[PDB]
């Protein structure tokens, strides 16, 4: 059980790092699709 808790601690740090980067991906994705929405507004007004 002690060994397994140690491995858990390792996986905990891994989880923290993945969580941060996953947040990065979600924010970036939303922002670039916001830019897509801006293109939507722009080109619809252009017509």
């Amino acid at each position: 059980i002690e060994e397994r808790l140690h491995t858990l601690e390792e996986e905990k740090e891994e989880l923290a790092q993945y969580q941060k980067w996953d947040k990065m991906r979600r924010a970036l994705e939303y922002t670039i699709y916001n830019q897509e929405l801006n293109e939507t507004r722009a080109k619809l007004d252009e017509l």
Binding site: L8, E11, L15, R25
Partner: protein, 49 residues
Amino acid sequence: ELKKYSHVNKKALDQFVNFSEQKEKLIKRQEELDRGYKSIMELMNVLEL
């Protein structure tokens, strides 16, 4: 970054907290159990006497 971090085991944090507390509880049980065994042996020798 996604491709590198695919296989992470979620739920680890709650696992850690709960299982650490429960492990402490059982360890305390174990120490009490040891002291009890010691006491039994001493009392048994006294009875023999």
